[PDB]
Amino acid sequence: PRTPVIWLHGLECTCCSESFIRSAHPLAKDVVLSMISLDYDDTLMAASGHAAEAILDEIKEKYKGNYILAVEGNPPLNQDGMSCIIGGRPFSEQLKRMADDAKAIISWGSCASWGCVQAAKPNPTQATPVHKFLGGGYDKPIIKVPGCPPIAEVMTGVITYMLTFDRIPELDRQGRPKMFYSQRIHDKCYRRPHFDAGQFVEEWDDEGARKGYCLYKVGCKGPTTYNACSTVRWNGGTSFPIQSGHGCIGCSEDGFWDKGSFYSRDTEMNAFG
Amino acid sequence: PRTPVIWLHGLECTCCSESFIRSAHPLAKDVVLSMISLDYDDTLMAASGHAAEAILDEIKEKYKGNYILAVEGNPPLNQDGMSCIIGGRPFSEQLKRMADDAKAIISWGSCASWGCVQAAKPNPTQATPVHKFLGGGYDKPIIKVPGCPPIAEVMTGVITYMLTFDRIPELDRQGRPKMFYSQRIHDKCYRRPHFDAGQFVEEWDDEGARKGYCLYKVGCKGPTTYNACSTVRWNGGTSFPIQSGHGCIGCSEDGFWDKGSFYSRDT
Amino acid sequence: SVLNTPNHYKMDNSGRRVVIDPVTRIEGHMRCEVNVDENNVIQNAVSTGTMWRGLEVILRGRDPRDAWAFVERICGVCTGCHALASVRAVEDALDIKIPHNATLIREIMAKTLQIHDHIVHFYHLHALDWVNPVNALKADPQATSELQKLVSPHHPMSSPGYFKDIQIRIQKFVDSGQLGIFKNGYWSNPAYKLSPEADLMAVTHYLEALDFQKEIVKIHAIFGGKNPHPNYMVGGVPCAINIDGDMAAGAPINMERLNFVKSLIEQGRTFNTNVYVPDVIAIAAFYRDWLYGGGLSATNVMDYGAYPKTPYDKSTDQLPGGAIINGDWGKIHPVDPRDPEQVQEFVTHSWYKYPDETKGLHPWDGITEPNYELGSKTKGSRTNIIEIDESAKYSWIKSPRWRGHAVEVGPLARYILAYAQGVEYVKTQVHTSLNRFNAVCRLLDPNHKDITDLKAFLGSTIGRTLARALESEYCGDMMLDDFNQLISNIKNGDSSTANTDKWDPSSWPEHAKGVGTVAAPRGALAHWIVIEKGKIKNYQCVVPTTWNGSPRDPKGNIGAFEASLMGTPMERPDEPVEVLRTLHSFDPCLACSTH
Amino acid sequence: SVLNTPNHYKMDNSGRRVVIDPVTRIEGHMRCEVNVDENNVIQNAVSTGTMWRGLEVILRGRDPRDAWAFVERICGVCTGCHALASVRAVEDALDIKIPHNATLIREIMAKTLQIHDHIVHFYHLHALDWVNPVNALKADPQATSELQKLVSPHHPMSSPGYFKDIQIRIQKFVDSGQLGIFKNGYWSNPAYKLSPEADLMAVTHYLEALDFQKEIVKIHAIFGGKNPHPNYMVGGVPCAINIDGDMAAGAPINMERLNFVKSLIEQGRTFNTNVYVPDVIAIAAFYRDWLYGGGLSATNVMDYGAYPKTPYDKSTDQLPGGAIINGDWGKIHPVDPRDPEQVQEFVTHSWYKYPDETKGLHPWDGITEPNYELGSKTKGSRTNIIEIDESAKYSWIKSPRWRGHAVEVGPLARYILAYAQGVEYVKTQVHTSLNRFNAVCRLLDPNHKDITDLKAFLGSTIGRTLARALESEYCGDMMLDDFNQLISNIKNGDSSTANTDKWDPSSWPEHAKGVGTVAAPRGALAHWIVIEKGKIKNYQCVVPTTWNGSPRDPKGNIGAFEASLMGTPMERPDEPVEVLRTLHSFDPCLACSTH
Numbered sequence A: 001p002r003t004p005v006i007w008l009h010g011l012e013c014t015c016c017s018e019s020f021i022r023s024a025h026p027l028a029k030d031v032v033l034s035m036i037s038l039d040y041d042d043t044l045m046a047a048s049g050h051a052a053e054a055i056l057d058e059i060k061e062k063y064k065g066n067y068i069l070a071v072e073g074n075p076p077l078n079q080d081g082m083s084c085i086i087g088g089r090p091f092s093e094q095l096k097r098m099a100d101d102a103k104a105i106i107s108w109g110s111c112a113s114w115g116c117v118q119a120a121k122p123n124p125t126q127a128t129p130v131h132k133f134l135g136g137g138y139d140k141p142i143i144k145v146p147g148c149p150p151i152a153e154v155m156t157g158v159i160t161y162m163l164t165f166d167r168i169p170e171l172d173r174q175g176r177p178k179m180f181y182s183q184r185i186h187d188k189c190y191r192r193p194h195f196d197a198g199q200f201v202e203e204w205d206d207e208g209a210r211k212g213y214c215l216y217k218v219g220c221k222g223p224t225t226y227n228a229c230s231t232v233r234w235n236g237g238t239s240f241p242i243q244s245g246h247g248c249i250g251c252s253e254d255g256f257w258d259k260g261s262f263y264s265r266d267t268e269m270n271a272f273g
Numbered sequence B: 001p002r003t004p005v006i007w008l009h010g011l012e013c014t015c016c017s018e019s020f021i022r023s024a025h026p027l028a029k030d031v032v033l034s035m036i037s038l039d040y041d042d043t044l045m046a047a048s049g050h051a052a053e054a055i056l057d058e059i060k061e062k063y064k065g066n067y068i069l070a071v072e073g074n075p076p077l078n079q080d081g082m083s084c085i086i087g088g089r090p091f092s093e094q095l096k097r098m099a100d101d102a103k104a105i106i107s108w109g110s111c112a113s114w115g116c117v118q119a120a121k122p123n124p125t126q127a128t129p130v131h132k133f134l135g136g137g138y139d140k141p142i143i144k145v146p147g148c149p150p151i152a153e154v155m156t157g158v159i160t161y162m163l164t165f166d167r168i169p170e171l172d173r174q175g176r177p178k179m180f181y182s183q184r185i186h187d188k189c190y191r192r193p194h195f196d197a198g199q200f201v202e203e204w205d206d207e208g209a210r211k212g213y214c215l216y217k218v219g220c221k222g223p224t225t226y227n228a229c230s231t232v233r234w235n236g237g238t239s240f241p242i243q244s245g246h247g248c249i250g251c252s253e254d255g256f257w258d259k260g261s262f263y264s265r266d267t
Numbered sequence C, D: 001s002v003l004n005t006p007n008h009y010k011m012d013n014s015g016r017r018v019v020i021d022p023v024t025r026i027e028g029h030m031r032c033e034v035n036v037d038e039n040n041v042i043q044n045a046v047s048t049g050t051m052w053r054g055l056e057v058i059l060r061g062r063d064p065r066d067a068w069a070f071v072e073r074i075c076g077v078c079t080g081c082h083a084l085a086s087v088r089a090v091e092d093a094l095d096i097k098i099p100h101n102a103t104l105i106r107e108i109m110a111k112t113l114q115i116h117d118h119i120v121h122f123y124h125l126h127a128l129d130w131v132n133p134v135n136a137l138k139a140d141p142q143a144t145s146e147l148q149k150l151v152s153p154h155h156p157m158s159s160p161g162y163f164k165d166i167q168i169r170i171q172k173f174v175d176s177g178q179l180g181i182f183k184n185g186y187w188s189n190p191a192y193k194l195s196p197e198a199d200l201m202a203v204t205h206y207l208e209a210l211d212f213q214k215e216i217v218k219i220h221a222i223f224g225g226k227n228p229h230p231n232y233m234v235g236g237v238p239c240a241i242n243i244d245g246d247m248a249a250g251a252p253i254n255m256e257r258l259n260f261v262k263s264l265i266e267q268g269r270t271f272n273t274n275v276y277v278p279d280v281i282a283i284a285a286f287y288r289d290w291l292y293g294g295g296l297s298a299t300n301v302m303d304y305g306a307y308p309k310t311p312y313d314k315s316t317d318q319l320p321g322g323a324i325i326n327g328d329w330g331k332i333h334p335v336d337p338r339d340p341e342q343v344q345e346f347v348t349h350s351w352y353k354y355p356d357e358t359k360g361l362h363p364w365d366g367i368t369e370p371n372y373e374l375g376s377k378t379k380g381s382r383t384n385i386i387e388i389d390e391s392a393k394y395s396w397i398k399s400p401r402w403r404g405h406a407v408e409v410g411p412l413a414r415y416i417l418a419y420a421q422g423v424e425y426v427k428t429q430v431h432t433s434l435n436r437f438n439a440v441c442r443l444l445d446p447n448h449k450d451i452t453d454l455k456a457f458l459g460s461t462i463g464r465t466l467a468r469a470l471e472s473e474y475c476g477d478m479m480l481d482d483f484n485q486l487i488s489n490i491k492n493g494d495s496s497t498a499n500t501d502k503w504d505p506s507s508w509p510e511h512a513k514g515v516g517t518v519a520a521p522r523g524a525l526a527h528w529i530v531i532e533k534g535k536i537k538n539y540q541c542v543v544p545t546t547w548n549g550s551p552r553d554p555k556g557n558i559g560a561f562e563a564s565l566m567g568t569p570m571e572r573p574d575e576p577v578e579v580l581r582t583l584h585s586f587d588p589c590l591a592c593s594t595h
């Protein structure tokens, strides 16, 4: 039997789901047909309405304690939770019910991990990441796979690791798999030689831009952002933000939307600070 | 009419020809069918012997001054040139004859550009790169595309540039296209942060190796090697030597085989 | 009650109520309720957007140069289109003209999104309303091959052994007892009309499309760093160009990257022509007797217009905009997003508050103040809606109207507008598609009488689905033209990508307002910004699904989703395949609709 | 003259002489001369290697740890195999045992090379000896589709419209009048026996193979940095493994890289079984009446043996080695590369000097001193050879013999040795291939009598070509097993990749010698090294094409190339299709042969 996976969607933009199907290896088609059993996912599922809600009830009982609960997006606490309604009820109630009997949770993306864009000031819906919603008493692992969205092969890499090696990957203090989130962008950035030489893009499309100089002065948040973008890179290893000429905006880090303007320079650069 | 290309082979291992067909974009099939007319290439020709020789004669005459002469490998000067025999005669004679009427020459790879492995001490065949063989009086461009072999998309990128933009790409003082050869590996190396922090592989498969630390102390010649390996990378952008854990050996640089052990530090 | 709407519908909620929540195979969260009469015909339809995040509120006080990244995250399906609308809005406010290569690269990214979004929509979201994968298990692989060769003679992948191998895989999946996404599908509903062979061909192409789709977005990764959510900037594009100069290999765009883009464009064009367009035409032929779902498309359609052959000259738009009203295709009303009498949003049936709720607000004057409040006729409670009260506030989607008219937006709207304005490429696509449709119909029914009525054909759920596929093909051809123009510009000495004259806020006026429009995959998108002293004073989005998914307005006009369901018979109201098929044909993006 | 060789050939140079120089569609440079009798039957054959670089000389005085990179550049086609032989030779000399993952990764790289090399050889070097692209232009696309479906039912790419589109492209190419690689091909020669439909199918697969081949070598890029010329090292592999630890994303081998390798392996397996193997079987059947070219293959074959299921235990070799002599398949003579009475190289007919040229030198005692000198019976001059004098020195290739015997090496030799030693996988491949061959024959000729004689079937140019394809398929299966073992090792806690105990030369003996063997794509490869005081004292390579392309020895025994041509009738001696077909079936690598 293939590992049961319930993929819930709260307040979200669906970018993590989209990223997942970009995976070059394994292909999403093979993940779904041969590796996991994607038992619920409002994005791709044939069933709607009452027929869809029947699956949640059935999987919860039949596979009690044995399904992985993947969560994209997050629960709002304002509007009595009814800024995200599923089956006529707050999404938060769906999330809680399914979390109760999960084997483990995967928090896909910055929404589920931290809050992402809806949580940026002033957070009108009181959108709350999954771990904070469930609280300190929650007794199953929550694997945070942050990024807006995460890299496709990182998402499928977490799943294949669990299926191949029969354990949760080692997590850092923030719950992120060391597999992918244990270096900063700037710790493995091919433009670092330019940073070191004080060779920067000073204005868009200047001499430096056309030579691929460092993007620190135009707002690159690579110095403070832990992710695999400069190592695994994006879309089958085709590019990453910095390669294509825009600084990292910090999109996998807790609170990145309110850290400062994306064109503000990154902080804590000096050891004598 | 597609641009006539004559691709000669001297003393070589054929790696540049192999690299060429690895090109992810454009595909080699499309280059040959739609972009150039690959009029002679010993590796792929249907005809052999006299029938093959007849083509060189024909193209040289029909397209005098209008074909690109691509050269892989190099001419030997020892053994009266007969350490590389084609059609019963020294390869050097074939090379000279075709160079006389070429529009331009592409020196594919380190063999044609510099000498490569056969030119390493003591160079038993006196293998000589194309530009040195033809001498200072040669009056057509010689575009050096070095590397052992060059990256596939660099090779096809040079060709597509010439076809698209209707000029020889700008060359550095060594004749290498600035398109691809105007940065050192170390100038765009994703392991540079580790170099900067003194984080090195000290012994194979140590902690540093498993973290992707810099390969300087195990002999990486990235600091002195101009190529696109850390930017374009290899095999459809899949990897490059350093990513996969071995230092650069300097394979695009003149004289790299005799610069010292590959595991001795770059100085 | 029986409500006689000004747009000529009779909304009657006396019949049996059917509730669909969640509506799946969309982006985001929707609820739909309908009433059916004694003959199982829909006589009332209620569109409820069931999420809201408040991007318009979140943007306040921030730097206009940062806006594009916030609003991009309105949606990860139509990823990039909001960033494009944002940079255009800021550039409009601040009188910034971008270099031609920036224009072209943004349009290349836009057309990449159109192709990717349309393909994934049709296969991964829509197809299961037309295709029965369980029925595919009954197909003869040789007959499936024969059908494939007729449907798309150029597509190489037609071997009977290939179709048999696909069938074995789906059989293994079914035999496992872990049915995944197929579980509880309405597979016994006679609303499914494909032969087993057509079902197997379509399942095969769902898999081929899932494999293909990850390739085309590599164009976004090259120009914009990543997909989803590529990068943009005010004043240009960040992907600086260096083909032949010092350190070219390290520039965002060099010879190798351009060669990669060429390859990707051609692969997309081939998939559009050999797989996607032929499938939609052939599936339409199987459903030739199911012409429901036209709704407003027959009468009131709108787009802002896009893809000018000459930058900044809308008379050259390759998908020209305007509004057709009351079904008069001979009269194109000009649409001006700056005119406060044209685009207006009402909230009387939405979960928002205005000081004066009789008013429709033009978006420069828009207000987004949440007001989640259920009508007193609701069945259920505040946190448990059993049957929503559509006489009161019933959606997180605002109600946009154009001069007080409810309109449909989307590829079908654009195709109508382009056909009516004599765009020859589109006229040729429409007529050749009708001829092909009629040809496949005759394969299925040798006594078929050709359809000739273009309004009946286009103005349907089938037509809406077809227009999306045709638009994908058109975008692939346009993208290749854009690429060729980019190469030409570079060849002619122009590698420039950004204008920075107005990058610094000290160069801005103290007060400015701007609007940016986009032909987004689902229809007419615009963002309206008001800037004060370097900061965002108001930022209001009206997005395609806001138009289509709109609740009723103060006059009682129904929006495009509700209109499209009216008068549709259902084989089995409790297995609402017809409702899903029609709603899905609008490609609802609910995160977009509500933002 | 008429020379009666001890290996039972009668070399008669009295008939008409035909010279082929250059031999094209090989790696490197070769000249071949034959004599034909009055019946156009070859009665003499002369193999001349027409290049030399001197790697053995160049290596003297260098560091054994650097050697692999120098010798890798012996060849860019069989790229990697010389690096593998080199590190094995040094490890042998210094008693270095490598970690299991290093063994496995090297074998995965080796099998990647086998698959790439074999596929590209068959399609891009060999096929034009069997396939007439001009005749392809006459094919019916529907009939081509039918043939394709019979040849390989599982291959998806069979649409008549696809074959028509390929044909249109080739027609456009021909019509351009720029014939490129096809110019002056021997297309009117009756030696070409395919139907137009089989020609079109084969041309189509030539193109598919050209697109595919660039994919599989991505396994070399992952483990070895690049292809051609991946990196190796003495004591292990440089691609350190970190799946779950700090900075895993920056390690050479992590979860994402392993997933990439899995995908690439499966793509290679699919191409082997759906395209390559079926094509060789089907083309063989069209050539069922052309069973020439066996040469030594039915009598004398050798390989060192490779791919042990248990590392460092040769009794577990999945392609077991040994020597079969005088056609006795029931007696496997053990081969020991250390035994000075076994592998020896003579130079009496080669352009080299020994102090005592009567001697055959075991490679630890090998000498490489050039002596370019032409026999006084040469037609032409020192720098213009018209007809080479094969009574004297006529090649840059040395003459290797095994216990004085001339032997054939290569996939066919390994297949004979494996079959004779009861390797069930190989026996199944051989029997199933023969059955499939006979089945296709019966379709082309319903009155066909099944071939049952394995020595006649395998011992031919057809058999040599088939064995290569079967070996490719075997290597894909083995490589998957290796990958699964690598994953298992990692799962069981072993991510180690290198043993550094003997990395520093201070740890080495003052004097040491070693030998490394490889089952290279073309046959039996070994490197012999002598180390003195940390430096290379002698380094001698004996390469597969050295064996096969060997000139005569002092006793007058002919090598495999020369033997394979003897007795072959030619339709047109001046259009030497038959010679090319047979020579090419050995997959000559001339840079290898001479190094």
Ligand code: SF4
Residues within 6 Å of the ligand: A185, A186, A187, A189, A190, A191, A192, A193, A195, A213, A214, A215, A216, A220, A221, A222, A223, A242, A247, A248
């Ligand atoms: S600041 Fe950004 S661009 Fe510059 S080196 Fe660091 S991560 Fe790379």
Ligand code: SF4
Residues within 6 Å of the ligand: B185, B186, B187, B189, B190, B191, B192, B193, B195, B213, B214, B215, B216, B220, B221, B222, B223, B242, B247, B248
């Ligand atoms: S020494 Fe080599 S590995 Fe280290 S940063 Fe330089 S190029 Fe990269």
Ligand code: FCO
Residues within 6 Å of the ligand: C075, C078, C081, C082, C520, C521, C522, C523, C525, C543, C544, C545, C546, C589, C592, C593
């Ligand atoms: N297309 C799209 Fe998304 C919606 N609706 C936007 O804008």
Ligand code: FCO
Residues within 6 Å of the ligand: D075, D078, D081, D082, D520, D521, D522, D523, D525, D543, D544, D545, D546, D589, D592, D593
């Ligand atoms: N295979 C191969 Fe090349 C040869 N001969 C080597 O070794």
Ligand code: SF3
Residues within 6 Å of the ligand: A012, A013, A014, A015, A016, A017, A072, A073, A108, A109, A110, A111, A112, A116, A117, A147, A148, A149, C073, C076
């Ligand atoms: Fe991928 S749903 Fe997209 S917004 Fe930032 S993670 Fe959320």
Ligand code: SF3
Residues within 6 Å of the ligand: B012, B013, B014, B015, B016, B017, B072, B073, B108, B109, B110, B111, B112, B116, B117, B147, B148, B149, D073, D076
């Ligand atoms: Fe590519 S032929 Fe290979 S050895 Fe170094 S470039 Fe020469």
Ligand code: F3S
Residues within 6 Å of the ligand: A147, A148, A185, A225, A227, A229, A240, A241, A242, A247, A248, A249, A250, A251, A252, C226
């Ligand atoms: S913006 Fe996000 S995608 Fe990577 S480069 Fe920075 S963490």
Ligand code: F3S
Residues within 6 Å of the ligand: B147, B148, B185, B225, B227, B229, B240, B241, B242, B247, B248, B249, B250, B251, B252, D226
């Ligand atoms: S060895 Fe050669 S391939 Fe590139 S990384 Fe160094 S120049």
Ligand SMILES: [Mg+2]
Residues within 6 Å of the ligand: C056, C398, C540, C541, C542, C543, C595
């Ligand atoms: Mg709005």
Ligand SMILES: [Mg+2]
Residues within 6 Å of the ligand: D056, D398, D540, D541, D542, D543, D595
């Ligand atoms: Mg030798």
Ligand code: 3NI
Residues within 6 Å of the ligand: C027, C074, C075, C076, C077, C078, C079, C589, C590, C591, C592
């Ligand atoms: Ni959207």
Ligand code: 3NI
Residues within 6 Å of the ligand: D027, D074, D075, D076, D077, D078, D079, D589, D590, D591, D592
């Ligand atoms: Ni070789």
Ligand SMILES: [O]
Residues within 6 Å of the ligand: C027, C075, C077, C078, C522, C588, C589, C590, C592
């Ligand atoms: O959307």
